Amino acid sequence: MRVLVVEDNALLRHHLKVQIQDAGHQVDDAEDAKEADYYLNEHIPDIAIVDLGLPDEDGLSLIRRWRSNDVSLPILVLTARESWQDKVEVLSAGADDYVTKPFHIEEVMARMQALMRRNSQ
Amino acid sequence: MRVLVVEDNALLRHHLKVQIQDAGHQVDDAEDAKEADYYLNEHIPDIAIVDLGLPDEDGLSLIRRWRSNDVSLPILVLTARESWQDKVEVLSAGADDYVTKPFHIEEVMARMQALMRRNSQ
Numbered sequence: 440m441r442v443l444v445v446e447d448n449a450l451l452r453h454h455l456k457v458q459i460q461d462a463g464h465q466v467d468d469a470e471d472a473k474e475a476d477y478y479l480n481e482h483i484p485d486i487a488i489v490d491l492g493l494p495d496e497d498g499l500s501l502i503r504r505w506r507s508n509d510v511s512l513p514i515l516v517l518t519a520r521e522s523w524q525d526k527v528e529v530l531s532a533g534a535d536d537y538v539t540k541p542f543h544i545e546e547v548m549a550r551m552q553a554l555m556r557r558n559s560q
Numbered sequence: 561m562r563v564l565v566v567e568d569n570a571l572l573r574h575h576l577k578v579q580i581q582d583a584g585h586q587v588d589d590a591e592d593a594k595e596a597d598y599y600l601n602e603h604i605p606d607i608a609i610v611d612l613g614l615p616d617e618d619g620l621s622l623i624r625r626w627r628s629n630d631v632s633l634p635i636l637v638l639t640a641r642e643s644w645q646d647k648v649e650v651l652s653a654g655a656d657d658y659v660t661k662p663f664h665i666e667e668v669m670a671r672m673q674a675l676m677r678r679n680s681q
């Protein structure tokens with residue numbers, strides 16, 4: 440179980456990784472889109488948690504690019520963007536789930552397990 | 561693409577089925593847990609939309625029962641129960657997604673497509 444976290448908020452990015460590592464997985468944490476590509480190419484993760492607001496390329500663009508290149512791993516978006524329209528666009532672009540901030544780590548964890556649970560049943 | 565809708569609010573149940581039928585699928589609509597079992601046994605749906613508050617057995621109980629009997633089809637819960645704790649419990653019980661009412665049909669549709677998209681990629 441390898442997880443990739445893409446989040447530019449350093450504190451949040453670190454907390455997420457620790458939570459996920461404590462849950463029992465190997466985790467890579469990227470602070471922007473390009474660094475996400477680095478880890479993706481180094482080790483294709485089983486699942487990715489993706490933030491939408493990033494310093495350069497935004498999460499939606501990253502997701503579209505990845506899907507267009509046959510990267511099919513489950514992607515759960517965790518973002519401050521709350522509009523239902525963005526949820527629709529992001530999910531339609533290839534995201535598997537979409538959670539808004541502020542969030543409850545317990546729900547994100549349960550949603551990750553739902554994706555992993557089915558991805559490897 | 562066969563969908564099963566389990567909802568005791570008749571008007572809502574009918575609207576959902578029409579929406580889903582208009583989207584291009586065959587749809588069965590059940591008004592309670594036991595009737596859901598009827599359709600499930602008649603034709604195993606590719607995906608089920610499940611309401612939690614039902615006249616007799618509640619949605620959570622139905623989901624647990626189905627999962628315990630090897631029924632593994634994707635399940636998206638659509639309910640008035642909003643607490644994050646219920647979301648965690650229901651997802652942990654086997655639900656694949658959880659959407660609260662009131663909702664935007666466009667988001668539910670996008671979430672159903674995400675499940676179907678991966679379930680049959």
Ligand code: BEF
Binds near residue numbers: 490
């Ligand atoms: F910047 Be992320 F979308 F919260």
Ligand code: BEF
Binds near residue numbers: 611612614661
């Ligand atoms: F009765 Be359902 F949970 F909206």
Ligand SMILES: [Mg+2]
Binds near residue numbers: 491
């Ligand atoms: Mg950000």
Ligand SMILES: [Mg+2]
Binds near residue numbers: 568569611612613614
């Ligand atoms: Mg109900």
Ligand SMILES: [Pt+2]
Binds near residue numbers: 455
């Ligand atoms: Pt934190």
Ligand SMILES: [Pt+2]
Binds near residue numbers: 458548549551552
């Ligand atoms: Pt997690």
Ligand SMILES: [Pt+2]
Binds near residue numbers: 440464552
């Ligand atoms: Pt996991």
Ligand SMILES: [Pt+2]
Binds near residue numbers: 572575576
């Ligand atoms: Pt309606």
Ligand SMILES: [Pt+2]
Binds near residue numbers: 579580583670672673
């Ligand atoms: Pt739908």
Ligand SMILES: [Pt+2]
Binds near residue numbers: 676
């Ligand atoms: Pt469909």
